[PDB]
Design a protein around this ligand. Sequence first.
Ligand SMILES: O=S1(=O)NCN(C2CC2)c2ccc(F)cc21
Ligand SMILES: O=S1(=O)NCN(C2CC2)c2ccc(F)cc21
Ligand SMILES: C=C(C)[C@H]1CN[C@H](C(=O)O)[C@H]1CC(=O)O
Ligand SMILES: C=C(C)[C@H]1CN[C@H](C(=O)O)[C@H]1CC(=O)O
Ligand SMILES: [Cl-]
Ligand SMILES: [Cl-]
Ligand SMILES: [Cl-]
Ligand SMILES: [Zn+2]
Ligand SMILES: [Zn+2]
Ligand SMILES: [Zn+2]
Ligand SMILES: [Zn+2]
Lengths: 253, 252
Amino acid sequence: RSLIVTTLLEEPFVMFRKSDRTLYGNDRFEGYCIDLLKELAHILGFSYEIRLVEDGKYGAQDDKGQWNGMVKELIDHKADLAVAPLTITAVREKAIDFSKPFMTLGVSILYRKGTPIDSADDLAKQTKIEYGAVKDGATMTFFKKSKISTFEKMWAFMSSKPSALVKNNEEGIQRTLTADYALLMESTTIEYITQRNCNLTQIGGLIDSKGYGIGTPMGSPYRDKITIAILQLQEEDKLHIMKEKWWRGSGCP
Amino acid sequence: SLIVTTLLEEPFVMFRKSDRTLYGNDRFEGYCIDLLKELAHILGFSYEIRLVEDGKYGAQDDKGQWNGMVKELIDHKADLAVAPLTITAVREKAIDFSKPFMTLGVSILYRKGTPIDSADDLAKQTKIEYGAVKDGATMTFFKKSKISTFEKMWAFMSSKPSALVKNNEEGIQRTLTADYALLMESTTIEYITQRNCNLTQIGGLIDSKGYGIGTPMGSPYRDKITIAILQLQEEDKLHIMKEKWWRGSGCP
Ligand SMILES: O=S1(=O)NCN(C2CC2)c2ccc(F)cc21
Ligand SMILES: O=S1(=O)NCN(C2CC2)c2ccc(F)cc21
Ligand SMILES: C=C(C)[C@H]1CN[C@H](C(=O)O)[C@H]1CC(=O)O
Ligand SMILES: C=C(C)[C@H]1CN[C@H](C(=O)O)[C@H]1CC(=O)O
Ligand SMILES: [Cl-]
Ligand SMILES: [Cl-]
Ligand SMILES: [Cl-]
Ligand SMILES: [Zn+2]
Ligand SMILES: [Zn+2]
Ligand SMILES: [Zn+2]
Ligand SMILES: [Zn+2]
């Protein structure tokens, strides 16, 4: 029996391979998470089938507590693994079994260069510059439930204007380029664009300390096996090599 | 009540200074003590803190038997292990780690003004000695490492028995008294380098690890503590808790 792997298209984690031949099966995909998935399959000795999740979402719960996206697939036993930049959160951990993190990140700010803005505190105290995050993502949920006075003031801004929240990273990146808009985005993706689009930069440091984990249904025996494999991959400096493999662009002066 | 095994290690678990004799859990204070009180209240359990007898974190011997807090958890003599216990693959095969409550990496503790800039600089030369705490997580990393730089560095530490120190307190002195660089976890480096302005961190972080709460394998408290640690992080409580205990006179 092969494992069902649900995932999403997100640079540079999972991308479509380009080729002259028509590609079938797992051959269609490439990226950091694809290399990580082949490495886990190598260590644990299993075959898998990659399926893009249909609703194209990571996992948010509605007012009635029901989930969507990849997290729902794991809950409904419709998938064995969720290999994607799936942020480890307490609410998601109460529904699925996260492996230990394979990559660290924190929430930060994507914005233009040449601005006296030095922190998220500067965005909260002003109104001319609009800010937001990907709707129903981990970052937006952080601001929604946070009690820090600065982040409470920022969430009142995002929730009041529905256009402040973007559908995905691509729209948020586009909005920071076409309007006076700052995107609250996870640091790993910020590092990826700031090395390829020299117009954008990171503002301030990291506001929190989180990680990406491999999602499994609760009670899955593969969680602890993947955790140990991720630990072996880190100690062998291989998570370091394959991250530098996909994150290194031309750079920005 | 749950039995919690731990170790004396600044600033995670320390003896609370007092004129009168302290008994029970009142004897201890520190970051891990504050974390345990926070976890105990969230999960609603009572506990008894017991310093592990052999005074060790957890290493394997020649016969494969564990010692320290890890063995304490395997033999079910303790329910939780609240200490700066580094999450490693070999330990994860023996106990159930919670998700990390603190991030750290291996780095270098050495004197200021010295030319050494990285661990690779230490490997290429021989006049400046280097090592780590014996049978700790750092030493075990170099012993099993296949990276060519770390394979060479482990040959150096193992060749001269004095390169391995007994604990952090002795290792800090060897950087303060000899031409010696200590391979130390970054969180402990950050703590001392703000108290002893003659020491500094050489280079960046060599790897990326974390401290986790140890439980016996199959413990129902693992996920409960994991979720509680995640809530503590999202509520900025782990940030307040670390800043409280990472004090010092400060160094320019
Ligand atoms: O979501 S976690 O498993 N627990 C929260 N943390 C703690 C702040 C150290 C971190 C820090 C870095 C990670 F990669 C994961 C986590
Ligand atoms: O021991 S872990 O659970 N898995 C290894 N990592 C990965 C380098 C991201 C990290 C990074 C930071 C942590 F706090 C824990 C861990
Ligand atoms: C690319 C997207 C929308 C994902 C990636 N990790 C977060 C998650 O797992 O929810 C989202 C980013 C964010 O919310 O800042
Ligand atoms: C203080 C000591 C000996 C401990 C703390 N964490 C590591 C562990 O959990 O093994 C050790 C440090 C190190 O190995 O560099
Ligand atoms: Cl875990
Ligand atoms: Cl005792
Ligand atoms: Cl931390
Ligand atoms: Zn490396
Ligand atoms: Zn590298
Ligand atoms: Zn028992
Ligand atoms: Zn804070």
